[PDB]
């Protein structure tokens, strides 16, 4: 190389502003692909069916659709 | 690394003496080696990556 060697930089500002959560949202990519640390639309099954021996008074299924005061 | 064999020999002698064998007339009649495996580590070089092994016997 010439003089002092320069390679790919580790820059938190650049990485977070170019490849972060919101930047990935603004990108044009396949959003049906699962991303561990970012936005994706591989949807889950939700809370599973109650087993016959559990207490229905404690079994829970909904959070937002029933949110009262 | 011969401390392993020395530990085995010392323990065997102590065990035989405790069981009542005469240490004075106990001989090593034969041995048998049984491989168990080898742990591999990367070794990064100019044009290739090698794997160096540590034995387990």
């Amino acid at each position: 190389w010439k003089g002092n060697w320069k390679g790919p930089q580790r820059n938190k500002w650049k990485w977070y502003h170019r490849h972060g959560y919101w930047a990935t949202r603004k990108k044009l990519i396949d959003f049906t692909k699962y991303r561990r640390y970012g936005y994706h639309e591989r949807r889950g099954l939700g809370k599973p069916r109650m087993q016959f021996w559990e207490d229905p008074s404690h079994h829970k299924r909904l959070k937002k659709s029933i949110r009262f005061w | 690394r011969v401390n392993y064999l020395l530990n085995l020999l010392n323990a065997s002698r102590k065990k035989i003496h405790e069981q009542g064998g005469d240490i004075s007339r106990v001989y090593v009649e034969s041995y048998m080696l049984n491989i168990q495996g080898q742990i591999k580590r990367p070794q990064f070089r100019l044009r290739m990556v090698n794997l160096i092994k540590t034995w387990k016997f």
Binding site: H17, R18, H19, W22, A23, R25, K26, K27, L28, F31, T32, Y39, E41, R42, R43, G44, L45, G46 | -
Partner: protein, 35 residues
């Protein structure tokens, strides 16, 4: 993605494309809660 292109791109949830696929843990034909 760099600032000039970010300033002209729009967020994914500003359209309806998110609801036009059936991708889910079980496959590609998601049956939504409540059918």
């Amino acid at each position: 993605i760099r600032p000039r292109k970010k300033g002209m791109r729009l967020d994914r949830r500003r359209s309806k494309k998110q609801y036009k696929h059936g991708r889910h843990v079980g496959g590609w034909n998601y049956r939504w809660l409540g059918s």
